[PDB]
Amino acid sequence: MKAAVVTKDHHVDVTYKTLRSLKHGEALLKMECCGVCHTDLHVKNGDFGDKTGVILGHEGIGVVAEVGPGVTSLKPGDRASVAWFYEGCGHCEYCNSGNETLCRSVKNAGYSVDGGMAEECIVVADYAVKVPDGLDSAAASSITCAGVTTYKAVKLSKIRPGQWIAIYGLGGLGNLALQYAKNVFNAKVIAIDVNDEQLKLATEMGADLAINSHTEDAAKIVQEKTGGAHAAVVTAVAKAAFNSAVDAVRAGGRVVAVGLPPESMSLDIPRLVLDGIEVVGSLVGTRQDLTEAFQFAAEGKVVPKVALRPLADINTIFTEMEEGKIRGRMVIDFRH
Amino acid sequence: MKAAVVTKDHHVDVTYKTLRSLKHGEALLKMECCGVCHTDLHVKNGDFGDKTGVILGHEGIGVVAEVGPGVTSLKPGDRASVAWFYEGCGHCEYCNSGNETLCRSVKNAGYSVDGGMAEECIVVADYAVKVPDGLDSAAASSITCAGVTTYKAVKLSKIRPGQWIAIYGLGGLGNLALQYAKNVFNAKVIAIDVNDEQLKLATEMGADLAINSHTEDAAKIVQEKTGGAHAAVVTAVAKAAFNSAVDAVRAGGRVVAVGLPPESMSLDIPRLVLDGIEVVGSLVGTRQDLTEAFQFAAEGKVVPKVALRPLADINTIFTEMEEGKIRGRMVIDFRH
Amino acid sequence: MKAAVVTKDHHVDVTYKTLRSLKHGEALLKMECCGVCHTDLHVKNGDFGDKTGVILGHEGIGVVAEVGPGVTSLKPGDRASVAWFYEGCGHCEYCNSGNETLCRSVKNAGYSVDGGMAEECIVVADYAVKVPDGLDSAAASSITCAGVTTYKAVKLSKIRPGQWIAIYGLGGLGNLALQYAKNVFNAKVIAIDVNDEQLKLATEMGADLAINSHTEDAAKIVQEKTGGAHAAVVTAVAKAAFNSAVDAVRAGGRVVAVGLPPESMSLDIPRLVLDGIEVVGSLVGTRQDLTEAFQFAAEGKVVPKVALRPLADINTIFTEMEEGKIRGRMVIDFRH
Amino acid sequence: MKAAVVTKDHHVDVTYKTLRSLKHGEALLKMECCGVCHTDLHVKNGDFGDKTGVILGHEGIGVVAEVGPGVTSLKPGDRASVAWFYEGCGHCEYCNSGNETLCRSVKNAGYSVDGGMAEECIVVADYAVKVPDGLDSAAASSITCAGVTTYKAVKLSKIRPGQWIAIYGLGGLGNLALQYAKNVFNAKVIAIDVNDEQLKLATEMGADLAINSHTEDAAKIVQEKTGGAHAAVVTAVAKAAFNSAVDAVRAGGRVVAVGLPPESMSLDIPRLVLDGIEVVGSLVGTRQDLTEAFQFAAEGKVVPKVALRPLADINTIFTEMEEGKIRGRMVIDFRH
Amino acid sequence: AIPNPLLGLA
Ligand SMILES: NC(=O)c1ccc[n+]([C@@H]2O[C@H](COP(=O)([O-])OP(=O)(O)OC[C@H]3O[C@@H](n4cnc5c(N)ncnc54)[C@H](O)[C@@H]3O)[C@@H](O)[C@H]2O)c1
Ligand SMILES: NC(=O)c1ccc[n+]([C@@H]2O[C@H](COP(=O)([O-])OP(=O)(O)OC[C@H]3O[C@@H](n4cnc5c(N)ncnc54)[C@H](O)[C@@H]3O)[C@@H](O)[C@H]2O)c1
Ligand SMILES: NC(=O)c1ccc[n+]([C@@H]2O[C@H](COP(=O)([O-])OP(=O)(O)OC[C@H]3O[C@@H](n4cnc5c(N)ncnc54)[C@H](O)[C@@H]3O)[C@@H](O)[C@H]2O)c1
Ligand SMILES: NC(=O)c1ccc[n+]([C@@H]2O[C@H](COP(=O)([O-])OP(=O)(O)OC[C@H]3O[C@@H](n4cnc5c(N)ncnc54)[C@H](O)[C@@H]3O)[C@@H](O)[C@H]2O)c1
Ligand SMILES: [Zn+2]
Ligand SMILES: [Zn+2]
Ligand SMILES: [Zn+2]
Ligand SMILES: [Zn+2]
Ligand SMILES: [Zn+2]
Ligand SMILES: [Zn+2]
Ligand SMILES: [Zn+2]
Ligand SMILES: [Zn+2]
């Protein structure tokens, strides 16, 4: 079957792959859709180590073709997902405390195990969360990483209704972060990006304020217009956004780091201490987070911006991603 | 009366002052003693703006000599304190939510209002927390800032009993943080400093592990020996400790920033995100935090290491502090 | 001036009153409006002990006519409120931890100090929360108890967006609880009452499900239709509603008690334990809660249903209240 | 092998059984010890419905004799436990959020699946938590329910160090609740029981105050001596203790219900609301809770009081339990 | 001022 495979020179080989038979607890999905995440870009670029040979993809939606021995959580015909959180150990300090994505034995689709950017994908059944009936597959692909991650990030931000949240980076994740923050958590939102087209879309979807941080001083403007944001979620792919977020929140405010540029942020210590700032990393979401995130999309509370592409376009898509030419998500369509 | 006043060239002049009359809600303290905090050093060096002319000190313990109009919270004869949190507004998003030290109209003793390093001090009665009867004045002075700050920091760290907490900087604050962490919160403690003599004190007081971060790679050792600390409290006066703390915690761990070096810390973004790290600033403690911190010292659960000095020694003390020669706290003794 | 005063036989005498002069920290309000709360009914009935002679009312909105000595938080011409939380001590374990309504020295308007159901009212200035410009006085009156209490109750329930909250008693409080839950916290709502008119209004205002507990088995219907509510807020004046709510939640669910019938509720102990149920009392809101609650009404996110009445109608109103004939709030109007 | 089987007239028949073969994911334990919990008494009495035929026991410690297909979490020779929480589904709103004991598909040893009060016991390997090497088996049996339950209950109480906690029922659970509260969470403890013998033991093990609730008004004494307990943990087997706890706590205080009498508690509604009381049920502990609870015992921070008995004594033991004649735990010993 | 640790305070 055809798969997106990472190459040694950091490109994608759209090539032939043959899957092994199933083990106990596994299921085989015939894939319908797989979103392209910027994490796929980091992976293929070698940012998290050399993963030449891995099949990419962890916004995968597929239909169960076969189940392996012992499988009761899925049956043939079910629509299920292939997310970054592909499998946790189920029995550790993280897994049993409601923090399973931090499992130190975690397997991650499109990184440490073959992902869903291929015609077929093997999943661990109890970890392939089902898609609810009212949600179309292309939209569901976006929720499978972009959506769940930002739903969870906003949850973790401690933002309360009527409060100001600054969203940095309005791409695949960021646009959905805006929608969750506004439509689900009832926050007021500042949308911040270096790309005017991303900002145009944000305003179109209800961002209360929009700032181009390349031409403007984003933190200063947030402070002037809102009194300082109560929280921030940083989904941008550059350290400057993280640095700006620290200065954009009011005292006691929480910055949630989500973006993964291979860089360091700088945090002024007297600012951190004397203003009681908080900075916290967030990592995708638990299976329950994903279930909840899907249901919001099923009920139309968030609407993923998606465009369908054939698998052959994957290298071109990554160029578009690099160049900031994507509104929302590009979604690989395997449907014949 | 005599007062420690900040000079234009970042020293202290012992100066005669005559205090103004009390206003409504105020009280006059005849001071018994005043601890020297490293914050006094930052203040006099101009790290927080020029405060030439200000009376230093916010580890003050005094006896109420006189009360102004309307005062019922204090009466003549009471022993009360002069802390960093000298007065909050009492009616704002911070003051009413249990976060009063973050009040944006806060007055800080020894910085934005005359402090307690003088023979007399005017306090706002409702904000001058009383000292419990079972606690000697010199010991109480340390709890007034070093103690309440580290009590609150450990509380905020969310360390649970049996868990590992790394304490960076074992000075005036750090030695008390160790005592609170071990004796009150029942944590296992790693003590970390660049000074072997501070570490010896930590070990004497039951630190489970001690590490010299100058001669050893502290984070590596913490990871190796404990699997990574569940939390950290950083009271050190150098950015390297804040940077190391981020690497010394396990995934999901919380670093509580307390020290105030005029520097920035650096946070590797993928580490922050992929390991769900949390970094939060802590700022002294509420009046209730101080009351609780005082009570622990009164019952002997913590025992401040103190040495008494005359007011005339203040510049010398700051030199000892700068040079890393102080152990525990130096306390200005005004007593007869 | 005229005031609604409690009589020994549990009625109201609209009586001649001349207020005393202002003390330090106090302000004189010329009243515009005062809501009638069911708590005023409990008070006059002696449910909280004999309070013969007190002026009722703690949904008061008035304009500052005069300020006493030392007052800077209010000035003449300001619109401010008279709430149940009329004054706290400002310096105790409750006041400094964000729990000020639980202050053991609290003064409560219309109960332990003269309230706002009168043409004039003395307030403690720092505790008389200002009314935002964009909010009419009658609507503001409702927020001053019914609104803030239910805003806080829903906040305390820990209901998350998309989750089911069962609201018992859709009266003055209950109708606003519905509006905050739906419009501010983004919850799905079950409205439960014994009065079809109250339920009809709830449905008009967006209640997802509506149950008359005199005609149906409320908890059973909740369980069947929703799987059990994630939380409950009980604003009913009958113990049966409290008992039912405990049955109507799912495992791990939280019941927030708000109503004040002078009765006891019953908890099945094995149900409470084996299903990890939580039951908690909520008491109005802090000054910050009220400020926030007001702002939601100012922005039209909730809209109090009100009817204006002369002070002469107070006894008639209480009869209407007893008989369950009020939709929303009756508001005493002092305006020309 | 010999098993304690529940009879139709609420006794135990020591019965010879041949266990079925292991299924996938299962292990066979050869039992060393099984503590007798008061839950076994409730179960055999029919308090939770007719369970005639079930093997009792969920304080079981055994050595793995055999593992079934696919088992990697345990191997022959391991010491593992049989607790109340015998198996959860692993993928639901409770299991994935850190609340796995509330799983609606839970299997409970000695209730809905054969327990560990037998010479052999079949377990689900991933849920049979391993016992640390430094902990003797008899001691470990008590931590397996009495210990983990009270460790978790005190954790859930939100008691902070130096605060007052009231423990009702100083039996098997209660004595360990005292030890965890005192030695682990650093609380001050009021021990409350109807049995002077239990109280003598509580005092011997460090209880700060002891009250006999039969001869004294417990709540009245708690209020007078401590100003009201910050929290309460009710491990008693009578409703009067649950009712008393509500009056024993200070405002804002939390009552944790743990005991399982087949009765109802009464909760005065004005008390609940105007004093902001919290009442919450706690149900054993998660696998991580048990792991932590075991470690405290392994390190000697708690020391279960145990007495070894042969399986033949089981009916006599239940009589002793009924009559309040057991100090700590009776432990069925299968060794030698 | 904003930010401006300590100095920015009212
Ligand atoms: N933490 C997690 O669990 C998680 C999950 C998914 C993705 N991620 C990471 O989130 C980041 C974004 O993912 P994506 O798929 O949304 O990428 P994307 O390419 O779709 O969007 C990136 C956005 O960042 C914006 N940006 C670039 N520089 C900026 C700056 N200085 N300030 C503000 N905005 C700026 C770009 O204009 C673009 O709109 C990636 O690093 C990805 O690896 C993390
Ligand atoms: N957040 C607050 O509310 C608050 C309150 C009081 C003090 N402070 C700040 O806390 C800091 C320390 O206060 P103090 O009175 O304890 O100072 P101190 O001089 O008594 O102790 C300083 C300690 O830091 C150690 N140190 C220096 N470099 C280090 C490094 N690289 N790694 C580890 N340790 C190192 C020194 O050896 C010394 O032991 C100061 O910046 C002070 O202003 C903050
Ligand atoms: N906790 C607080 O801080 C606080 C604040 C304000 C009011 N209260 C109390 O809240 C309660 C309600 O106040 P209100 O002003 O909204 O009263 P209200 O008279 O306006 O409304 C009472 C509602 O309870 C309904 N009801 C009666 N029996 C019921 C039952 N068995 N099940 C369901 N619903 C039932 C009535 O039909 C009515 O709709 C009173 O006890 C009041 O004292 C508490
Ligand atoms: N919630 C859970 O997860 C969980 C776990 C284990 C046990 N339990 C339950 O906890 C309860 C106790 O278990 P146990 O093994 O410790 O029983 P136990 O027999 O060892 O202890 C019972 C104690 O309750 C005391 N008591 C009786 N009436 C009292 C009263 N009115 N006031 C104060 N104390 C009183 C008795 O004197 C005795 O000391 C049982 O109901 C059991 O089912 C619950
Ligand atoms: Zn992704
Ligand atoms: Zn795990
Ligand atoms: Zn200080
Ligand atoms: Zn303030
Ligand atoms: Zn009211
Ligand atoms: Zn108070
Ligand atoms: Zn048990
Ligand atoms: Zn489950």
Residues in chain E: 10
Report the Cα D165 to chain-centroid distance in Å: 18
In this structure, the answer to whether residues B137 and B161 fall within a common structural domain is no
In this structure, the answer to whether residues A44 and A154 fall within a common structural domain is no
Which residues have CB under 6 Å of ligand 2? A 273; B 37-39, 42, 145-146, 149, 168-174, 192-195, 198, 213, 235-238, 240-241, 258-261, 282-284, 321, 324, 326
Write the residue with the smallest CA distance to atom 22 of ligand 4.
D171
Are the C-beta atoms of residues B145 and B304 closer than 8 Å to each other?
no
Q: Which DSSP letter does residue B97 get?
A: T
Report the Cα A50 to chain-centroid distance in Å: 21
DSSP lists the bridge partners of residue D333 as: D33
**CA-wise closest residue to B147 among B303, B288, B282, B300:** B303
Q: Which DSSP letter does residue C97 get?
A: G
Which A positions 154-173 lie with beta carbon below 8 A of chain C?
155, 160-162
- Please enumerate, by residue number, every residue of C annotated as part of a binding site for Zn(2+): 37, 58, 89, 92, 95, 103, 145
Show Cβ contacts of residue C10 under 8 Å, excluding neighbours closer than 6 positions: C44, C45, C46
Of the candidates A266, A278, A283, the beta carbon closest to that of B274 is on: A283
Inter-chain CB proximity D275 and C102 less than 8 Å: yes
CA dihedral (B116, B121, B125, B129) positive or negative: positive
What HEC string does D172-240 produce?
A: HHHHHHHHHHHHCCCCEEEEEECCHHHHHHHHHCCCCEEEECCCCCHHHHHHHHHCCEEEEEECCCCHH
Residue with tokens 């004939």: C325
| CA–CA gap between residue A129 and residue A122 (Å, rounded) | 13
| CA–CA gap between residue D235 and residue D231 (Å, rounded) | 13
Show Cβ contacts of residue D241 under 8 Å, excluding neighbours closer than 6 positions: D168, D169, D192, D213, D234, D259
- Residue A77 sits in a domain of what CATH number? 3.90.180.10
| CA–CA gap between residue A273 and residue C119 (Å, rounded) | 49
In angstroms, the separation between the Cα of residue B210 and the nearest Cα of chain C is 35
Alpha helices, H only, chain B:
38-45, 137-142, 148-156, 172-179, 196-204, 218-226, 239-248, 269-274, 287-298, 314-322
Write the residue with the smallest CA distance to atom 8 of ligand 1.
A259
Distance A38 CA to ligand 5 centre (A): 6
Show Cβ contacts of residue A205 under 8 Å, excluding neighbours closer than 6 positions: A175, A178, A179, A182
The domain boundary, picked from B256, B283, B310, lies at: B283
Distance D57 CA to ligand 11 centre (A): 8
* Chains A and E lie in contact, requiring 3 or more CB pairs less than 8 Å apart: yes
DSSP lists the bridge partners of residue A249 as: A229
Are the C-beta atoms of residues A166 and A192 closer than 8 Å to each other?
yes
Are the C-beta atoms of residues D27 and D74 closer than 8 Å to each other?
yes
- Which token pair is C123? 């307030």
| CA–CA gap between residue A8 and residue B300 (Å, rounded) | 64
| CA–CA gap between residue C51 and residue C16 (Å, rounded) | 18
| CA–CA gap between residue A50 and residue A47 (Å, rounded) | 8
**CA-wise closest residue to D12 among D261, D319, D330:** D319
> Torsion-angle region of residue D284: left (phi > 0), alpha (psi -120 to 50) or beta?
left
3-class SS of residue D282:
coil
Q: Which amino acid is at B81?
A: S
DSSP assignment string, A165-215: EEEE--SHHHHHHHHIIIIIS--EEEEEES-HHHHHHHHHTT-SEEEETTT
Are the C-beta atoms of residues D230 and D159 closer than 8 Å to each other?
yes
* Chains E and C lie in contact, requiring 3 or more CB pairs less than 8 Å apart: no
**CA-wise closest residue to B222 among B192, B178, B265:** B192
| CA–CA gap between residue B227 and residue B220 (Å, rounded) | 10
- Which token pair is D253? 């205080």
Contacts of D92 in chain A (CB under 8 A): 288
Instruction: Indicate which atom in ligand 2 lies nearest the CA of residue B261.
Output: 41
The domain boundary, picked from D263, D283, D303, lies at: D283
Neighbors of chain B by Cβ distance (3+ pairs < 8 Å): A, C, D, E
| CA–CA gap between residue A163 and residue C288 (Å, rounded) | 13
Query: For D158, what's the count of Cα atoms within 13 Å in the CB-facing half-sphere?
Result: 9
Contacts of B229 in chain A (CB under 8 A): none
In this structure, the answer to whether residues D277 and D295 fall within a common structural domain is no
Q: What's phi and psi for D130, nearest 5 deg?
A: -75, 150
Write the residue with the smallest CA distance to atom 7 of ligand 2.
B39
* Chains E and B lie in contact, requiring 3 or more CB pairs less than 8 Å apart: yes
In this structure, the answer to whether residues C274 and C293 fall within a common structural domain is no
In this structure, the answer to whether residues D111 and D200 fall within a common structural domain is no
- Which token pair is C68? 């006493």
Helix and strand numbers (H, E) in chain E are: 0, 0
In this structure, the answer to whether residues B159 and B183 fall within a common structural domain is yes
Are the C-beta atoms of residues B161 and D293 closer than 8 Å to each other?
no
Contacts of A99 in chain D (CB under 8 A): 98
| CA–CA gap between residue A203 and residue A197 (Å, rounded) | 10
**CA-wise closest residue to C43 among C136, C125, C121, C113:** C113
In this structure, the answer to whether residues D49 and D168 fall within a common structural domain is no
Ligand nearest to the CA of D90: 12
The domain boundary, picked from C283, C310, C326, lies at: C283
Per-position b or e across C183-213, b if 16+ CB within 10 A of its CB: bbbbbbbbbbbbbeebbbbbeebebbbbbbb
| CA–CA gap between residue D33 and residue D29 (Å, rounded) | 11
**CA-wise closest residue to D291 among D119, D127, D52:** D127
Are the C-beta atoms of residues B68 and B25 closer than 8 Å to each other?
yes
Which B positions 12-71 lie with beta carbon below 8 A of chain E?
48-49
In angstroms, the separation between the Cα of residue D251 and the nearest Cα of chain A is 26
Residues in chain A: 336
**A221 and E CB contact within 8 Å:** no
**CA-wise closest residue to C58 among C123, C125, C116, C127:** C116
Number of domains observed in the structure of chain D: 2
In this structure, the answer to whether residues A267 and A157 fall within a common structural domain is yes
Report the Cα B105 to chain-centroid distance in Å: 20
In this structure, the answer to whether residues A170 and A140 fall within a common structural domain is no
Peptide bond into E3 cis (omega under 30): yes
CA dihedral B117, B118, B121, B126 (to 10 degrees): 20
**C96 and A CB contact within 8 Å:** no
Q: Which residues in chain A are immediately followed by a break of C to N over 2.5 Å?
A: none
Contacts of B112 in chain E (CB under 8 A): 6, 9
Q: Which amino acid is at B7?
A: T
| CA–CA gap between residue D80 and residue D131 (Å, rounded) | 5
Please report which helix (H) or strand (E) contains residue D293, including its range: helix D287-298
DSSP lists the bridge partners of residue B16 as: B2
In this structure, the answer to whether residues C88 and C155 fall within a common structural domain is no
**CA-wise closest residue to D99 among A98, A156, C279:** A98
Are the C-beta atoms of residues C205 and C226 closer than 8 Å to each other?
no
Distance C333 CA to ligand 3 centre (A): 22
Contacts of B185 in chain D (CB under 8 A): 161, 186
User: Angle CA(B19)–CA(B21)–CA(B26) in degrees, nearest 5?
Assistant: 100
Q: Which of A40, A234, A235 to mutate to test the pocket of ligand 1 (most atoms within 8 A of CB)?
A: A235
Inter-chain CB proximity A274 and E6 less than 8 Å: yes
Are the C-beta atoms of residues D255 and D231 closer than 8 Å to each other?
yes
Number of C-beta neighbours around residue A39 at 10 A: 26
Q: How far apart are the first and last CA of chain B?
A: 13
Per-position b or e across D178-217, b if 16+ CB within 10 A of its CB: bbbbbbbbbbbbbbbbbbeebbebbeebebbbbbbbeeee
**CA-wise closest residue to A331 among A32, A30, A19:** A32
- Which token pair is B21? 């009359």
Q: Which domain holds residue D22?
A: 1-145+284-336
Inter-chain CB proximity D162 and B295 less than 8 Å: yes
| CA–CA gap between residue D168 and residue D257 (Å, rounded) | 10
Show Cβ contacts of residue A203 under 8 Å, excluding neighbours closer than 6 positions: A191, A210
**CA-wise closest residue to A7 among A66, A51, A58, A47:** A51
Show Cβ contacts of residue A35 under 8 Å, excluding neighbours closer than 6 positions: A57, A59, A60, A141, A142, A144, A145, A146, A172, A306, A329, A330, A331, A332
Number of C-beta neighbours around residue A217 at 10 A: 13
| E-only strand ranges, chain A | 2-6, 12-16, 26-35, 59-67, 79-83, 85-87, 107-108, 120-124, 164-168, 188-193, 209-212, 229-234, 249-257, 264-268, 278-281, 306-309, 329-333
| CA–CA gap between residue C251 and residue C227 (Å, rounded) | 10
Please report which helix (H) or strand (E) contains residue C294, including its range: helix C287-298
In this structure, the answer to whether residues B129 and B8 fall within a common structural domain is yes
* Resolution for this PDB entry, in angstroms: 2.0
In this structure, the answer to whether residues D163 and D265 fall within a common structural domain is yes
**CA-wise closest residue to D35 among D18, D19, D55, D56:** D56
In angstroms, the separation between the Cα of residue A280 and the nearest Cα of chain D is 19
Number of C-beta neighbours around residue D24 at 10 A: 13
Residues in chain C: 336
Are the C-beta atoms of residues C33 and C141 closer than 8 Å to each other?
yes
- Residue D265 sits in a domain of what CATH number? 3.40.50.720
Are the C-beta atoms of residues C190 and C229 closer than 8 Å to each other?
yes
Q: Residue B89: is it exposed, middle or buried by C-beta count within 10 angstroms (0-12/13-18/19+)?
A: middle
Contacts of D70 in chain A (CB under 8 A): 24, 70
Please report which helix (H) or strand (E) contains residue C225, including its range: helix C218-226
User: Taking CA atoms, what residue in E is nearest to A221?
Assistant: E2
Are the C-beta atoms of residues D39 and D89 closer than 8 Å to each other?
no
